[PDB]
Ligand binder design. Structure first.
Ligand SMILES: *[C@@H]1O[C@H](CO)[C@@H](O)[C@H](O)[C@H]1NC(C)=O
Ligand SMILES: *[C@@H]1O[C@H](CO)[C@@H](O)[C@H](O)[C@H]1NC(C)=O
Lengths: 98, 49
């Protein structure tokens, strides 16, 4: 048994100044929309709803900004759909007194 | 972009959409282009003159 031939394959992993071109199988949780949830699409940890937009993005674009220079439109990679980013809700409690 | 002209390129506007991205990360300072030539029955077939 020790004299039978064996095939040996050695895997080597190195890190350089070149960016990552190989990645292990990326996990992807289910996409929930129209709810105040938190997402991280590789460039920002944004919290807000994900509505369905009507504006098409050119087939090289992953991010998106507005007039006020805020990231409010990000393309989902797996489904290549365009989803907007909106803050959930905020405000104050005003009262009226007789 | 199609055009019907030889020289003195038109003043029209045409943005350049990007193409496939190459994440190489190497060293670069010089470049050169490649051309193609034909060898018909008129030419003898030698790349001298
Ligand atoms: C994402 O990858 C899966 C297979 O892993 C494929 O079925 C799906 O069509 C892909 N979506 C794209 C390329 O938008
Ligand atoms: C790229 O070239 C510069 C100068 O030519 C050098 O300092 C640098 O180390 C090179 N990068 C790599 C990854 O070799």
């Amino acid at each position: 048994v020790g004299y039978q031939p064996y095939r040996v394959v050695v895997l080597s992993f190195e890190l350089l100044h070149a960016p990552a071109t190989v990645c292990g199988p990326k996990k992807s949780t289910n996409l929930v929309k129209n709810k105040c949830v938190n997402f991280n699409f590789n460039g920002l940890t944004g919290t807000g709803v994900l509505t369905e937009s009507n504006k098409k993005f050119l087939p090289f674009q992953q991010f998106g900004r507005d007039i006020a220079d805020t990231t409010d439109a990000v393309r989902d990679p797996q489904t290549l759909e365009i989803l907007d980013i909106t803050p959930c809700s905020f405000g104050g409690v005003s009262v009226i007194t007789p | 972009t199609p055009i019907n002209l030889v020289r003195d390129l038109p003043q029209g506007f045409s943005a350049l959409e990007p193409l496939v991205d190459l994440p190489i990360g190497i060293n670069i300072t010089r470049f050169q282009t490649l051309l193609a030539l034909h060898r018909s029955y008129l030419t003898p077939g030698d790349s001298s003159s």
